[PDB]
């Protein structure tokens, strides 16, 4: 489906040395808004050529979304693809209102994410 994203791009890197790419995925924190990327190591593959750093908005895997299996099977899915990596990700501005929601400050949120 397109649910009509901001501006999409897509970096492409490879698995690092512990088969993955060195982030955290979230489906949303704070009214579970986008996000997916909580955090990011600056030396993985996905923090240092990939730039999926903390407050990027990881949408697909490999040009497959995320948002529509489990958390469980997507960090799977990048697993899978043995070696290489595809990200793709959104940038979205949204609106004073979104934004600070989008932005993702007040930490009550815990909730069970995943990692790659």
């Not at 990596?85 to 930490?107: C, M, R, S, W």
């Amino acid at each position: 489906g397109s649910p009509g994203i901001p501006v999409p791009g897509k970096v492409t890197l490879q698995k690092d040395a512990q088969n993955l790419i060195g982030i955290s995925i979230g489906g949303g924190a704070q009214y579970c808004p986008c996000l997916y990327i909580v955090q990011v190591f600056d030396n993985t593959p996905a923090a240092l050529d990939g730039t999926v750093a903390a407050g990027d908005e990881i949408t697909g895997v490999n040009g497959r979304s995320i948002k529509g299996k489990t958390k469980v099977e997507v960090a799977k899915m990048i697993q899978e693809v043995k070696g290489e990596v595809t990200i793709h990700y959104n940038k979205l501005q949204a609106d004073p209102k979104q934004l600070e929601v989008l932005f993702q400050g007040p930490q009550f949120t815990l909730r069970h994410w995943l990692k790659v």
